[PDB]
Design a protein. Sequence first.
Lengths: 173, 173, 173, 173, 475
Amino acid sequence: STQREYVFIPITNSITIDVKITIGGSDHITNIDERGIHNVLVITGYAVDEKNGRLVPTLDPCDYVKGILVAGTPQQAQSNDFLTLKLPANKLYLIRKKGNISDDLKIYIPYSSPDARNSMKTKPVSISDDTIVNNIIKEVFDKIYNITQKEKVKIEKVKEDIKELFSYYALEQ
Amino acid sequence: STQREYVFIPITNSITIDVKITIGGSDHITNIDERGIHNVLVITGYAVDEKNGRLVPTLDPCDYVKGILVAGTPQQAQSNDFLTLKLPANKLYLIRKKGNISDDLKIYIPYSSPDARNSMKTKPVSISDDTIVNNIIKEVFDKIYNITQKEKVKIEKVKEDIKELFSYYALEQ
Amino acid sequence: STQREYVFIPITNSITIDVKITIGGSDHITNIDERGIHNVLVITGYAVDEKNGRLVPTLDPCDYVKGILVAGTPQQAQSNDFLTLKLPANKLYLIRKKGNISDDLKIYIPYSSPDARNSMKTKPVSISDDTIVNNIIKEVFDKIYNITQKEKVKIEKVKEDIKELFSYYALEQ
Amino acid sequence: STQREYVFIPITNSITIDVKITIGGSDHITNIDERGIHNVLVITGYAVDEKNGRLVPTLDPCDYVKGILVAGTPQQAQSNDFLTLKLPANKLYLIRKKGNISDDLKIYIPYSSPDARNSMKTKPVSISDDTIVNNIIKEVFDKIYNITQKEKVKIEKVKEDIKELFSYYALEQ
Amino acid sequence: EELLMSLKLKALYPLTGGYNRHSINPFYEELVRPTEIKGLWRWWNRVLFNTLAYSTKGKLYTYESIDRLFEDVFGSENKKSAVRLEVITDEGNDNRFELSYVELDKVIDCLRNYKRKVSLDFIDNTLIAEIEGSTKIPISFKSNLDIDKIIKDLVHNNKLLSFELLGFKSVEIDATKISDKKILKEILRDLITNYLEYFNIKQEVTFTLNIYLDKSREHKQNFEDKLKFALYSLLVFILLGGIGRKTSRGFGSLSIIDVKCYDNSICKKIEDLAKNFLKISSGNELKSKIESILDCIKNSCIDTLYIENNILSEIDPKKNVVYFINSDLFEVKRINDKEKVLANIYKAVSSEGCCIKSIITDKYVRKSFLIAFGGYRKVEKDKGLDIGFIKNYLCETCETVSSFNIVDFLLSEGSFMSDYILQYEHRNSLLRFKLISDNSNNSYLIGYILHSSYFKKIDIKYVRCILEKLTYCVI
């Protein structure tokens, strides 16, 4: 049926090898409708884990991360580490939400263990310094999205939108 | 080493035997003194698992459960299906917080599996049915805060607010 | 890339020989969508030279000419005396702007050697007396825009505008 | 902390060695910024003793000593003479206020026990005879405010109020 | 007669107004007006009092009756105020707006013998006087104040500022009839002053709000109680509102830099409550502090004493409209950059904003939400969108999906409240955004929704996280 996996967008390059399938489905949730990224998901309470980038659940309601989600299958020798769950497609805090949905979908989510060893001091961080936007537009978007140079040619739109929109919380340790 | 444990308030009978420890040290986060309940915790993003009462995660920030904090670790027969968390006493969303905190707390949330084979139709639930009300006034609140009818002869107050201060979202599955 | 040509509009019709591109491609700026004209370019600091119509570059900013700008090549025997250069489509001064372009524009402009012999005092010239304009909508607004007579029959919407939307300054020589 | 020295402004010259701090900090109450003096201070019920000038206390509400406020300790000659006091920065009758207050200050005022030996009658005094104005503009307004001659050439602008503003009372017996 | 309590305060991007509707004019600058502080304090006092009297007696009182009730501390035409406000700005000396020279006389030539609108735009770091008759000229001037090139693009990006700037941006000159260069020059000179004065926006204004109490107003009947409630409400005003224009969109947001109480028996219970804000580590900490100070009044504070006096007057729920705070709606976040937040409030509160478009769909509810919570909005009875849809969603009866139902909004029987929600131009926004700061760089964002008497059993459950998602998107 309908299955996708979420990826986040950190400052670090911990995204490269975490999946088997890049495309998966003829329809993605985050379509580039000539206006930038669309239907992006935000995850509340969760912070990134740049060293082995995943999502640790903080119960802080002010902590959050925002990333995209597309079809595929993330290295099936998993699920001891991923919070994979199905939901009726509406409990998602989907921002830039353009079109309608299927009212159900399964989704993989990266996840680091509880790790109750330290003081989980969190730190907010944004995506600036376009040099750190080139690596992602080549390694998160030029990887997952072939939209590059097939429909829209002024990539500058999605470039500024990814260097303005995605900002999250890191546990900085 | 001073931990705490989170306990919910459902409309089901899944509360009694969840922890062994009732004191641990000398203090508890949730409090009761002449005025109502203090430091009532709220964990957002999680629903209850009334059948085997635990916290089921979702992708909703609007999903939340209000409950209580005691001092202890669960029954010393767990740590295979619970969520530990060491937080610096700030990222906690208290309610009616009165006293100063330790800036180091270990919390234990009754965690559960997503059972990713059905649609998670979460439902808002209030606290009603004075049967279970009067039950939890003593079976969990006098098993912990026994003071009622010794000094807390004003149990109506605990009534007054548990009817309104608490509510949650569940799955009803 | 992008290549286009601009045609002024005087009170006369000496522009019987003009750009050849009729269909050509998929880009034309001075469109008419059932509301009159859109994206009329104003070349400021110039004056028209209707006798061999050529925008005479003055240095006074009050002087201006207003006319059509569309994709096409002048004659294949031009780029000698015309003014031609490229601009990123955000510098040209249009009016009734309905949309943007591909941020690139290389336009040929009817240009002249200013003829520094007779001191060029200008005069505002209007576009009235539809007795002229009635043929301009068959000699220009059909010689390129065969859209007429088949697609849109709100002709006065594109008549009374040109009666006031089109005016310029002329060196009177 | 912050301490201030009250340099009264008479037409006497006995005020040469009167500070143990020239500037020391970066905060003078009395200022000069291209308009004149600021925050001149008035203390009623006090008459100077210009024959070795010191603030002698009379109980008359119609006496007054006007002076400037600078920062620092008295001389290394203190603890017997000055009437030091700690005021919450609102007990100050500051003529020509320009800034705000530190909300508490230490003030030292060169004070003399009344010497109850004679009827301590007094007499008002105005600062005239620009000769003394000139010498005090060097004595204090170049020694404290070396900002003179760095930008301020309008000393006559200041000299104007020096001849007008710092009237006072003295026993003159 | 006696200094009651000082306050060091801070306001960010204040949009104060004067006679010329700007913070600066050819005569003085006034970034903070004590009259506005007094009037806003009174407004917040009335809101807080209705919150109190509604959280106990479920009643609501008219603003007249409340103002008559508190006229011993706030004064009226029958009594002089007991509290005296004194704002003191540091480096708030005598500046003004001087326009040394403007090089006109070339924009005038393209004007004469015509009827031309003259827009101005200030982008490109230079002033370019556009002409509707398709002509553009750049103007050279040298003025007293220096627009810092941050304010320029701030106004450029903030779609709210760039809107209310429409009213200081152009004139429609008519030079067909006799029109001499002197009066044209003066017209455009004053147009340019008006435009340039809009850009006196200085972030981070610091001022000291002193407050003096007249001890002559001894305990007449309930003076200490009225006064303590007034001070509670002044604190709530500093913590939920700002000063100036567009306070319901982030601007002017106040912050406490220091507090000093001088009459302990009165302000001792407020100076501590204010120290309770001189340092805020995390967001939920601040939300807790807010709910603490808010509930502290509803039950913990003095009592329901004068609420049992025969000076008050119940509202008429169909002809009167009051607001009052609802503690359930107090979303907080953390900023890390203020200008971007102030810019995105637009997407939050605009009917085609890509932060509420993605929180509400089918768009009618969307309109509805704004028309109920986002102040006045020009509605049109011309293109169907008014037909039924909003008319059905605000209707208090007649269906059960709209999480908001206006008390007296009737289908085709609209009597008063229709002519107020859809016709009254000066209606505040219930949905308000404030930007707070501690003495560190911890910038948060209180979102909250004022509760209005013209709602018929609002669904607090619904908007409580619609508002949460809104706060999520703008940050």
